[PDB]
Design a protein around this nucleic acid. Sequence first.
RNA 1: GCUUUACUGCAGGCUGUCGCUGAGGACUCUCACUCCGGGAGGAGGACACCGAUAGCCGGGCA
RNA 2: ACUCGUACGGUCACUGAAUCCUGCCCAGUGCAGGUAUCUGAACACCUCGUACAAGAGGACGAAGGACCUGUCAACGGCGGG
RNA 3: GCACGGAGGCGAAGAACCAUGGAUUUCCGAAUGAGAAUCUCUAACAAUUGCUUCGCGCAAUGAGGAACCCCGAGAACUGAAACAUCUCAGUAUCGGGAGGAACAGAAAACGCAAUGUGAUGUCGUUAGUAACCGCGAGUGAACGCGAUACAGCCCAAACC
Lengths: 237, 46, 119, 194
Amino acid sequence: GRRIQGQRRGRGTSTFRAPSHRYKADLEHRKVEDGDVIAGTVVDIEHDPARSAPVAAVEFEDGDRRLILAPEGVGVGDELQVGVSAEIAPGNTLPLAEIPEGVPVCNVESSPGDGGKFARASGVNAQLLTHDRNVAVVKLPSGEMKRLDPQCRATIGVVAGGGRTDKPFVKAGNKHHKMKARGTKWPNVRGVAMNAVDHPFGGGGRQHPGKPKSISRNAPPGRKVGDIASKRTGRGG
Amino acid sequence: GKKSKATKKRLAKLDNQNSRVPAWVMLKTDRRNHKRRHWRRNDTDE
Amino acid sequence: PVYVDFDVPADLEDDALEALEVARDTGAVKKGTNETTKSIERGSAELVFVAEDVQPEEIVMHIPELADEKGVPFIFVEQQDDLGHAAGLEVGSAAAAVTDAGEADADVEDIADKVEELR
Amino acid sequence: ARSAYSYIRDAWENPGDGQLAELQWQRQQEWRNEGAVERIERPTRLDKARSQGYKAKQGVIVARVSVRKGSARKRRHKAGRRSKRQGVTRITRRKDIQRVAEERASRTFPNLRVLNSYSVGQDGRQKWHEVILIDPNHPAIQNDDDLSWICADDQADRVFRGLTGAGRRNRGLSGKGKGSEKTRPSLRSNGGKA
RNA sequence: GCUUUACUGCAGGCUGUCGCUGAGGACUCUCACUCCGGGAGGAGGACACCGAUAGCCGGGCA
RNA sequence: ACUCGUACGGUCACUGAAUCCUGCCCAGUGCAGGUAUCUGAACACCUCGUACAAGAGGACGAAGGACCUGUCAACGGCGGG
RNA sequence: GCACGGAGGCGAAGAACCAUGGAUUUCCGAAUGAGAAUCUCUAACAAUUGCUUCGCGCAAUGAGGAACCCCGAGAACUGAAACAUCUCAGUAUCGGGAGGAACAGAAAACGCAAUGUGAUGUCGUUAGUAACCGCGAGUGAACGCGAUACAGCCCAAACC
Ligand SMILES: [Cl-]
Ligand SMILES: [Cl-]
Ligand SMILES: [Cl-]
Ligand SMILES: [K+]
Ligand SMILES: [Mg+2]
Ligand SMILES: [Mg+2]
Ligand SMILES: [Mg+2]
Ligand SMILES: [Mg+2]
Ligand SMILES: [Mg+2]
Ligand SMILES: [Mg+2]
Ligand SMILES: [Mg+2]
Ligand SMILES: [Mg+2]
Ligand SMILES: [Mg+2]
Ligand SMILES: [Mg+2]
Ligand SMILES: [Mg+2]
Ligand SMILES: [Mg+2]
Ligand SMILES: [Mg+2]
Ligand SMILES: [Mg+2]
Ligand SMILES: [Mg+2]
Ligand SMILES: [Mg+2]
Ligand SMILES: [Mg+2]
Ligand SMILES: [Mg+2]
Ligand code: NA
Ligand code: NA
Ligand code: NA
Ligand code: NA
Ligand code: NA
Ligand code: NA
Ligand code: NA
Ligand code: NA
Ligand code: NA
Ligand code: NA
Ligand code: NA
Ligand code: NA
Ligand code: NA
Ligand code: NA
């Protein structure tokens, strides 16, 4: 047959790429030699095309102007601090170790100094639970317990823009506009609505999957479609 | 369209190659321009 | 480095090269790793020199143990061009051998003893 | 008595033992950071180089080349093929890694000609070889009775035509008797069956 | 052309083994190697990656 | 490539606004988890064989399978008496 | 000039014509200062190399050629009255490269087993033999011999 859509993706052609040239900034924590004396002022609050959430422009004492992952409750004029000695207030960045437990955090680093990887989408947050001279247990938004190096820097507060998911798109047109800002092919044609040659679920006099939808982890690309290595399906039980 | 100096030189040449075999040549050889390109019925390169 | 098992103090190295220079003018000297090797093998070696800035190291790796199973004394030298110049060459030399000193057997003998003591 | 050279050689019979072992464990670290073709002032194996024609002289050059280990990097068939020709994983090239290395070097020095090459070890994913090249245009070589032969026009791009030592063994030209029916005088004149 | 529990194979995935690969049936370490860090240095570590091979799955493809 | 992205994400599928709803079935097929015991290749190892070798056998046993379990908004099924 | 017109001209100062050698030889073109559909913009071996007075100072490479030659990559139709090994075939085609010819070549050979031959190509033969093969269809040498032409040498190391 022909390569399925999932396979056309990987080639990275225009249709599948994200409009990178239209993006603003790669939101990452700053690199401080050490000390914490690094502080800056919020200059403006801008919209981030890549995340559908706000982001804050900040000017640092050392003339550095950079956009930053804005937590909720950060306004123009506010003073933010990034370092080991950072104060413990919303918008400030400092290693998990210096952070008190029970405090919601966002934009958490997986490796000290990697700039932040976890908890960065609209209104999400991580929850620093345990400390130690070795491990810093954090609970990510998915609910998983992640052991982390306490030297990993993070930002206090929940990400801005919370609740974005509460409103329905209502119409195709709205989906369309959002989709246009992401690296994604949209709308979606069902496999069963295709021809045998185009998808493992294609063909037939009527529409229905040909075989069972749960597919093995070992299935090859071109065939791994439907419910990938599902441990269970349905709602029952 | 906008032509370059070179294109213009080539068009000029084609226009020239489009002239007739002079009268005297007919006499000098005791007796056709196989390159008669019409602007409408024919087509030039480029 | 891999064939170097002890460090020769700058001063010692200086005295050693000094001895070598007179050795060429009074007694006899062998310049070049191949010629040094045959000395150690033929026994006609009293003191052999080996540079430490030799690349590749294979060119000399053998000198130590060979000299040790032959009872011949050897000393290390940081530079390679200094050993070559001290031997009287306009070029460098990875190894040199004092084949019968000359008006320096006293120093050589001592330098040998100093190294032995230097372990 | 033994030449000093004999010692370099005797060491390289067991590159995984003794001082040479520790030496390699160190070098490769630097090598894995160098490029694909690095020119070097001195051969890592003097005895071998000299044995193969090397000479501390103007116009004689040496270079270490790195090449990946393993079978052919082959793309699977994109059209009909009988089962016999659908292979990918077990297919190996007919040119050995050493020749690949000799060619990568010669291309790097367009004006030079390959003289010979030898192995200098390998880690788990690549092999290194040192190639000896010659400047057929330098008078220091055009006047050398033991090398000026490589200056002749018909020696141009000799590595690409298999005229190298490794090139000739790989062409199955070692045996002068039985077994070399389809190799000598050339693979191509024998309809490519050797 | 297409399908599948048709025949035969071929990619791919999983898994064992050998090489890279080192010090003291469960374990510590650091020095290769990998990753984070501008760097100092951190994490990981003889595993992973990669090369070779073996068993299983394998209309994704011939 | 996704990705100047990080689960309020994005990938793979099914159904197809709203409203009232969505029963029974895990035997088969699929997927997933577990597994005393059984089965399970090659290297290394042991025995026999061979002044070596081919070869035969043994010990050990990974994934996988048997076996057990979970799962149908998973493929699908919902009869005769 | 082909090219046999009109006008006019050149040649005994030996023209035309032919041979060899030299002068001139625009732009693009490997195309090389940079850019470009044959043009343009502000001193140029661009790029990769060798030597090096370490300065592009001295040099090299690049591209072409009817096929031939050498080194790599490598099908399928077809034949087997289907078809998978096999066959078509190491063919077609593709990548890299040399020369006027390439390649090969002075035995770690042969093995008419010998008290024998004596670098290598090629031609004739050996022979559709030995050998391979769903032992099917098919595939398929060599030594030797008769010829052609003949040619044998240099390093590494020892010792200096
Ligand atoms: Cl969305
Ligand atoms: Cl060459
Ligand atoms: Cl004979
Ligand atoms: K066929
Ligand atoms: Mg980023
Ligand atoms: Mg939704
Ligand atoms: Mg788009
Ligand atoms: Mg749809
Ligand atoms: Mg349809
Ligand atoms: Mg299909
Ligand atoms: Mg339907
Ligand atoms: Mg349906
Ligand atoms: Mg006109
Ligand atoms: Mg020939
Ligand atoms: Mg990296
Ligand atoms: Mg098929
Ligand atoms: Mg130009
Ligand atoms: Mg047939
Ligand atoms: Mg038949
Ligand atoms: Mg054949
Ligand atoms: Mg024979
Ligand atoms: Mg000589
Ligand atoms: Na279908
Ligand atoms: Na026209
Ligand atoms: Na070359
Ligand atoms: Na063959
Ligand atoms: Na059709
Ligand atoms: Na069932
Ligand atoms: Na079931
Ligand atoms: Na001319
Ligand atoms: Na040039
Ligand atoms: Na220059
Ligand atoms: Na037929
Ligand atoms: Na048929
Ligand atoms: Na067959
Ligand atoms: Na006879």
